[PDB]
Symmetry: C2
Subunit: 237 residues, 2 copies
């Protein structure tokens, strides 16, 4: 049984209370919602271990989405941060502004998106797990994962040194590939990993360019604030 | 970084390496989809993924990778990361959405189960194999934690395949790119490599056998084993 306040009248984005450590994945769908002006609700989950929540996301993490299907016959769900980006682009990005408008654009968007999904994302997750969460400190494992993060920064730096390559996938504009990558490739995150972000100058310039976008600024403000307003948990007003 | 003499793109080219038990579990994924759809393609056996010419195709320096003609045939495009190669082949060659999804509802579930593989079991299995075989020092505590994380992913797949009428991971009715992406890391032979008893996940095991019985899947496993062991060892196969 769902909490009485969980109703799906529009896209519902599931988050947790905003902290330094709780927002690097939930901000991704929120950036795209803000870029496209998608109507949406925010649901602050007190416990991702709650049985009702595992019915939405069997991986028991945020972000997750519930939404009405286009014809209204079904409740759709999206989970895994990359999947939430794919879902929002499919349902709401009519012109392929962030998803890609042709096979050529989508080929590069999916390359750079999937590189984040399979390489930097899981490597960063494992680094954080062994650094902070694992009951025993395994420094040789932590060092290897940190090394692998620098290799991923090297790949992104190479790409952003290519002539006219202002964004990761497309030369001309940011895509879901850039949105997926940004939270794991910005100065604050590099510093958490014990790295000097200045050692990847084109990647740092790209992170600042992304950070100056009004939708990205709004997304970071909102994700920090969730659960700290008039309502702590549940459907926000 | 000059391309080898024998690298031409007249149709889809799939980049692979010499076939072994542990070199084919990602390259087999696009090959299954190419076999399912009957997409004309060439096979290119890469001797060294560290070669500069190859990093101009895939900056991550791994197989699988694809070069193909653009839809209008005036340009060449690339796909790399096994999940990206599946998304590309579905975009360019699955116009009916038989494997990619026919509508927003179907694609929502396909992308959930495909991304779960891309983010969780895929990278966890890659790190398991890295620390087990490739890392110069054995780190058994790390290897054990990664093995434990594989069982947690098997538990999620098992839960899904116990849902009423849920014969495949994404859709009830037919296999999709989510099923193709998952299969090589969720079959008895791979479970045994990980030191797991695959019988502990009965609906997952039954699903792996149902996928394995498909003619396209049999053809893909058959071919991927043989690449680099024929009359031509490296380069464009005939």
């Amino acid at each position: 049984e769902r909490p009485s306040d969980l109703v799906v009248n529009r896209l519902v984005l599931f988050v947790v209370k905003g902290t330094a450590t709780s927002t690097h994945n939930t901000v991704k769908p929120l950036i795209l919602l803000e870029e496209l002006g998608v109507p949406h609700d925010i649901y602050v989950v007190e416990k991702v271990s709650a049985p009702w929540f595992s019915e939405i996301n069997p991986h028991k993490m945020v972000p997750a989405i519930l939404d009405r299907s286009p014809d209204g016959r079904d409740t759709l769900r999206a989970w895994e941060s990359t999947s939430t980006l794919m879902y929002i682009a499919d349902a709401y990005d009519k012109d392929g502004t962030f998803g890609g408008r042709n096979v050529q654009e989508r080929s590069e968007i999916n390359n750079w998106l999937t590189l984040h999904t399979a390489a930097l994302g899981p490597t960063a997750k494992y680094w954080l797990y062994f650094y902070k969460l694992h009951p025993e400190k395994l420094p040789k494992t932590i060092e290897k994962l940190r090394s692998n993060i620098t290799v991923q920064y090297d790949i992104l730096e190479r790409r952003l040194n290519e002539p006219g390559q202002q964004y990761l996938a497309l030369k001309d504009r940011p895509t879901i590939a850039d949105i997926a990558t940004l939270p794991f490739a910005m100065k604050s995150t590099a510093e958490l990993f014990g790295l000097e972000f200045e050692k990847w100058p084109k990647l740092q310039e790209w992170s600042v360019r992304m950070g100056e976008r009004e939708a990205v600024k709004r997304a970071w403000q909102r994700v920090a604030g969730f659960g700290h307003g008039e309502k702590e948990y549940g459907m926000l007003e």
